[PDB]
């Protein structure tokens, strides 16, 4: 009935507990000793922190709770704008770019950027095999380069070639530097240029694209073919911009984490790797993947939904309460009251998913349906949940059964996990060394 807290600093309230390099895995040890919710404060605001399954699947009522702006999504909104995951469920906007761009990113929609993908994927492996002896790779930046370049050509037909470079293309340059910045807050001179090094890039290429009228497989192409079918308008450029900014922003760094976590938890638990292995082996029987084998890498699927689960790249997110009401019969909130869901602790949840729950075990998801509803949220909720989920799970089980084909894979240090946070939740200095299999490619 009353809700647990952690310590206060007086009127610095709660703040100083989050004065660390890593604060989502601090709160999972707040949540480990205070439960299922409590309360965080700083001078401007209060949170309550959800971390199990009873009370999340409550807040994921969209009767009752909606989508909340937290600050993160403030600061990323100076140049993320009005595009889809920085906007209020209610803005105008959100609605008619969510009602154009759904069907462009189904699971359907994932056999027209497939060849794209895989032209990127290729670029991957090809670098990999290309290692002497002597070497060895470094994942977490590799699978970042494969993602910006993924979502480039992709999202609006432009390369930025991030394998042919140490120093990244100046787009990426500054769109690193304006997230880091975005998160820092939680320069001014520098952040205001790095956002026109942006939109100059991305309106550019809107204008190009318009010029030539030229058709392609991407996202811009849809874009600027598509009708909202409520209001019957298009997207206007500076919005389509903002999407193309905020594909880059939402979707590069957590499916990079995903892949580098999923390769750390093969290479921790080789039993695991050797069957995830032995499916690639059997099912991609062609120097190029097609769209329809992906499909069939079924273990594969499980490797990254059990990655997921252990570290959701996205860790938490944020909620509002739409009017007054009373959470799991036993806490009242008002109007307006803000709910943050800790996704890490939601998946250690023991009452569903058994003691073990800190093993890396993907058979846990070999019957999707048992799983209960709103156990497993590493791409949110409802109307506001990930829209690039397909595209995000298509690339990474195409570009994770290619490197299981062709390469046997050594964790020569050791590795000790030690996990980076900014937005997103990535392996630090996780390296490895690829032995090649000498496949066709
Ligand atoms: C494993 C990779 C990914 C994870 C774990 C992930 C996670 C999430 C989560 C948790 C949300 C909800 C945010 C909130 O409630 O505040 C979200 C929203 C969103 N994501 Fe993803 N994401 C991933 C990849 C992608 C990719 C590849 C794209 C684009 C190509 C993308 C684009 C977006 C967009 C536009 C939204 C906002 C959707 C809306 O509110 O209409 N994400 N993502």
Same mark, same amino acid.
């Given at each position: 009935k009353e809700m647990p807290q952690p310590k206060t600093f007086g009127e610095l309230k709660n703040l100083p507990l989050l004065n660390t390099d890593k604060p989502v895995q601090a709160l999972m040890k707040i949540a480990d000793e205070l439960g299922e919710i409590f309360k965080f404060e700083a001078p401007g605001r209060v949170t309550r922190y959800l971390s199990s399954q009873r009370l999340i699947k409550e807040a994921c009522d969209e009767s009752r709770f909606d989508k909340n702006l937290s600050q993160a999504l403030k600061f990323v +909104?100076? &140049?993320?704008?009005?595009?889809? &995951?920085?906007?209020?469920?209610?803005?105008?906007n959100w609605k008619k770019a969510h009602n154009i761009l759904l069907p462009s990113f189904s699971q359907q929609a994932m056999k027209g950027y497939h060849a794209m993908m895989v032209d990127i994927a290729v670029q991957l492996v090809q670098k990999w095999e290309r290692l002497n002896a002597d070497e060895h790779i470094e994942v977490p930046e590799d699978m970042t380069r494969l993602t910006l370049d993924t979502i480039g050509l992709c999202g609006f037909?432009? $390369?930025?070639?991030? &394998?042919? $470079?140490? /120093?990244?293309?100046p787009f990426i340059t500054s769109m690193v530097r304006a997230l880091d910045e975005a998160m820092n807050k939680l320069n001014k001179r520098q952040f205001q240029e790095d956002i026109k090094v942006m939109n100059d890039l991305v309106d550019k290429i809107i204008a190009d694209r318009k010029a030539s009228g030229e058709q392609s497989d991407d996202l811009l192409t849809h874009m600027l073919n598509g009708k909202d079918p409520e209001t019957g308008e298009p997207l206007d450029d500076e919005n389509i911009r903002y999407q193309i900014i905020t594909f880059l922003i939402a979707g590069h760094e957590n499916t990079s984490g995903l892949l580098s976590f999923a390769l750390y938890f093969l290479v921790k638990n080789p039993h695991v790797l050797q069957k995830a292995a032995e499916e690639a082996a059997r099912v991609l029987v062609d120097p190029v993947p097609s769209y329809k084998q992906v499909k069939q890498l079924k273990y594969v699927g499980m490797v990254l939904n059990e990655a997921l689960r252990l570290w959701?790249?996205?860790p938490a997110f944020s909620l509002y309460a739409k009017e007054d009401t009373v959470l799991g019969g036993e806490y009242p909130l008002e109007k307006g009251d803000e709910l943050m869901v800790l996704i890490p602790q939601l998946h250690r949840d023991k009452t569903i998913?058994?003691?073990?729950?800190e093993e890396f075990r993907?058979? $846990? &998801?070999?019957?999707?349906?048992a799983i209960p509803q709103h156990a497993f949220k590493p791409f949110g909720n409802? /109307? +506001?949940?990930?829209?690039?989920q397909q595209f995000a799970l298509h690339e990474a089980t195409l570009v994770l059964g290619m490197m299981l084909k062709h390469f046997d894979f050594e964790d020569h240090t050791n590795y000790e996990l030690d996990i980076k946070e900014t937005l997103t939740l990535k392996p630090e200095g996780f390296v490895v060394k690829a032995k090649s299999k000498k496949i066709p490619l």
């Open positions: +909104r100076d &140049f993320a704008g009005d595009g889809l &995951f920085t906007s209020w469920t209610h803005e105008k037909n432009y $390369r930025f070639n991030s &394998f042919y $470079r140490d /120093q990244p293309h959701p790249t996205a998913w058994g003691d073990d729950v993907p058979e $846990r &998801f070999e019957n999707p349906s409802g /109307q +506001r949940a990930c829209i690039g």
